[PDB]
């Protein structure tokens, strides 16, 4: 019935702010927090992401967390920044300094109980809370560390509820903080254990989209954060908008996750656009169905053609021929059956929304459990094991109290998931 969002660190609060900018217009809510839209389907399931207030005002069910008042201030002193309840801004002055230990163990731990004071208040005023939504930076410190600390600490207090995350995997292409594969792997070790599902927003794919496709020479965060939110309104479309289903986080989890460690989804929206560009010609259902299953469209830098889809959930928006949709989806699977597991009967499920997004007559979201997600993890271990070999930068972690073996404990927990993803990839029915 209800969802509690949280955002951690720089990226967390940056990608999270944008999600709240997109879904407010998608619901006819103004920067003031008041409703002024036409259709009443915009209010049918509004309870999900919004708290009803006085003066018939809506306020997002979101907590703003960071060990730095930076992004925190730019957001608050920004566009839709007025919309959020100022009390929920749980902002410390430490600064995890791109350190997992600083956020999860040391400086972050000091804050966490203050954050939890707020999550408890938001969960209380819920007819039925279904679960939590986390938007965070996987290479950082508050995002990566404190964010997973917060997970473990929430998963403790509410084991019965869904734990869904939007984790942004770092790329040496986008960020040159050398320690990222340490904070990356350290966070993976935590996700595989305390989240129902995870959307892998890989910063590598994100960049290549803006660079090679969108032809933006010097992509700004704005150009990447736009692709993130476009995917996020997409994946959340059925949770937010009424229709065919019903439309629960647990119903998805149950159907989309066959094995519990493997809940990392490879998102991948079609049609790819440049931040704030006017759309000329829209695409047809074949153009959509086709483009949406392209590696060139995945938000994680993995080739679905190198793997096998355990599950797929494709979400189409706008007004289109479903018989044409069913014609196309069954063309795709029935021609490329080799990429889908024989031992999961009917692994591809398609949902359609008549409400398309801003400036798009038609869009089409992709959520798949392709074993090819191993490529993302593989990468990370090769980056980590390169540094951990020469035991590089380690004193940044140890000096925070952190143990040497905690790294090797995470390195191999990470190394297991890859063999585990491979195991099911090679696995056959016969």
């Amino acid at each position: 019935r209800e969802i509690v969002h949280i955002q951690a660190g720089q990226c967390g609060n940056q990608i999270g702010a944008k999600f709240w900018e997109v879904i407010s217009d998608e619901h006819g809510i103004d920067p003031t927090g008041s409703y002024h839209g036409d259709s009443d389907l915009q209010l049918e399931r509004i309870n999900v992401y919004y708290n009803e207030a006085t003066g018939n005002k809506y306020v997002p069910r979101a907590i703003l967390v960071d060990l730095e008042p930076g992004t925190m201030d730019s957001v608050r002193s920004g566009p839709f920044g007025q919309i959020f309840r100022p009390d929920n801004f749980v902002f410390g002055q430490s600064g995890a300094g791109n350190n997992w230990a600083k956020g999860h163990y040391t400086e972050g731990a000091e804050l966490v109980d203050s954050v939890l004071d707020v999550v408890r208040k938001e969960s209380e005023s819920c007819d039925c809370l279904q679960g939590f939504q986390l938007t965070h930076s996987l290479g950082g410190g508050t995002g990566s560390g404190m964010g997973t600390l917060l997970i473990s600490k929430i998963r403790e207090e509410y084991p019965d509820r869904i734990m869904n995350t939007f984790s942004v995997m770092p790329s040496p292409k986008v960020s040159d903080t050398v320690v990222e594969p340490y904070n990356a792997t350290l966070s993976v070790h935590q996700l595989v254990e305390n989240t129902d599902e995870t959307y892998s927003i890989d910063n590598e794919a994100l960049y290549d989209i803006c660079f090679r496709t969108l032809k933006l020479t010097t992509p700004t965060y704005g150009d990447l954060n736009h692709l993130v939110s476009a995917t996020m309104s997409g994946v959340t479309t059925c949770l937010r908008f009424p229709g065919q289903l019903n439309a629960d986080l647990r119903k998805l989890a149950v159907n989309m996750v066959p094995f519990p460690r493997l809940h990392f989804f490879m998102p991948g929206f079609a049609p790819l656009t440049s931040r704030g560009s006017q759309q000329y010609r829209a695409l047809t259902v074949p153009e959509l169905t086709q483009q949406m299953f392209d590696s060139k469209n995945m938000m994680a830098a993995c080739d679905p053609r190198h793997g096998r889809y355990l599950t797929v959930a494709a979400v189409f928006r706008g007004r289109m021929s479903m018989k044409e949709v069913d014609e196309q989806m069954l063309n795709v699977q029935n021609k490329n059956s080799s990429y889908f597991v024989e031992w999961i009967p009917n692994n591809v499920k398609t949902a359609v929304c008549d409400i398309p997004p801003r400036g798009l007559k038609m869009s089409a979201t992709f959520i798949g459990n392709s074993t090819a997600i191993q490529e993302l993890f593989k990468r990370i271990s090769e980056q980590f094991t390169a540094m951990f070999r020469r035991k590089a930068f380690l004193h940044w972690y140890t000096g925070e109290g952190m143990d040497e073996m905690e790294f090797t404990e995470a390195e191999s927990n990470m190394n297991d998931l890859v063999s585990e993803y491979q195991q099911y990839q090679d696995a056959t029915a016969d």
């Binding site: 473990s152 109290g401 952190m402 905690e406």
Partner: protein
């Protein structure tokens, strides 16, 4: 020849050929009261055996309608005694999961306190 004479009658034997052979030849109340009294025993016994054999069938029904009653009350035992186990076995299993996973967590909440300790140690 003559036999007798009367008012509204008369009689007279009339011989034709006399015999060649001179000379000619060559109930109790108790026993009825016993033989009758005996017949009624016989009648009253096979009709008493009929009564016995009919009263035997009268128990077969008294036994049959019982099987039906017992069959159902044991069915309702078997079913209720299944739910009792199933719901409890589940309550056992499910809660024993939630508590094992809160210990994994409890322990991985301790790892944190000893790190905040290993940091203080170094200082």
């Amino acid at each position: 020849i003559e036999l007798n004479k009367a008012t509204s009658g008369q009689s007279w034997e009339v011989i034709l050929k006399p015999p060649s052979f001179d000379g000619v030849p060559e109930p109790s109340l108790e026993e009825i009261q016993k033989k009758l009294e005996a017949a009624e025993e016989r009648r009253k016994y096979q009709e008493a055996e009929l009564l016995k054999h009919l009263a035997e069938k009268r128990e077969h029904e008294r036994e049959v309608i019982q099987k039906a009653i017992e069959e159902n009350n044991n069915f309702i035992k078997m079913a209720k005694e299944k739910l009792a186990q199933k719901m409890e076995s589940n309550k056992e299993n499910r809660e024993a999961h939630l508590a094992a996973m809160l210990e994994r967590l409890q322990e991985k909440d301790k790892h944190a306190e000893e790190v905040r300790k290993n940091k203080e140690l170094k200082e």
